[PDB]
RNA sequence: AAGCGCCAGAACU
RNA sequence: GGCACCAUUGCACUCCGGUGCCAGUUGACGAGGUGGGGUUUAUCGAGAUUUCGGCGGAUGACUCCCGGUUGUUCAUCACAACCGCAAGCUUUUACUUAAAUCAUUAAGGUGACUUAGUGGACAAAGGUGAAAGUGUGAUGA
């Protein structure tokens, strides 16, 4: 069920890489430390967001928190991920 | 310091 | 890389849909070279995706004019080939810091790439001395 990585749709998909990885940053910075925010603007991978937390209770909050949260004009779908991340993993 | 300058066809970003 | 649109609500850990508009980046590595006017597709090699394509420049070549050398002095007009602070032709003899590519590893940028250092090697043309040979007449001191 619930995972270090949490996967987050439904974003404003104008928003280039750089801006929105430091923007996503500055809101899961205080559920607990993330270790890599991975952000993809391709067809199958753009509106999208996975955020590695260190704690399983940090992606826990943040998605209790954060769901249909407005960022950039944008309410926010959040999931836990289906596999473990390639940071946690391995 | 004159195989040197430039950039807009092309290519890459 | 960026802006608009069409399309996508999509579960991945080296990049990863299309069209148009805009921006950025690449875009010659050294040697060598200027009496003037015209003309023109301006010399030499190194490298090897574009050093391609376009445009500008240019010291080249050719030609004529201009001013000169050499043809054993030296004045003058031809004749012969040259030179534009150098200068007949051939046979030889050094000198003339090649740089990039390559490998490498530091800085800067979202990136394409850029700036710099280090390591080692390789030229061609030309020109600059040297050595032996071979090149005019006509008229006058």
Do not use: W
């Not at 940053?25 to 391709?42: E, N, P, T």
């Amino acid at each position: 069920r619930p995972n270090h990585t949490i996967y987050i749709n439904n974003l404003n998909e104008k928003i280039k890489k750089d801006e929105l990885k430091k923007s996503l940053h500055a809101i899961f910075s205080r559920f607990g430390q993330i270790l890599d925010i991975l952000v993809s603007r391709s067809l199958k991978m753009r509106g999208q967001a996975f955020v590695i937390f260190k704690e399983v209770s940090s992606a826990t909050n943040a998605l209790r928190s954060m769901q249909g949260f407005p960022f950039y004009d944008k309410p926010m779908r959040i999931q836990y991920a289906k596999t473990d991340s390639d940071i946690i993993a391995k």
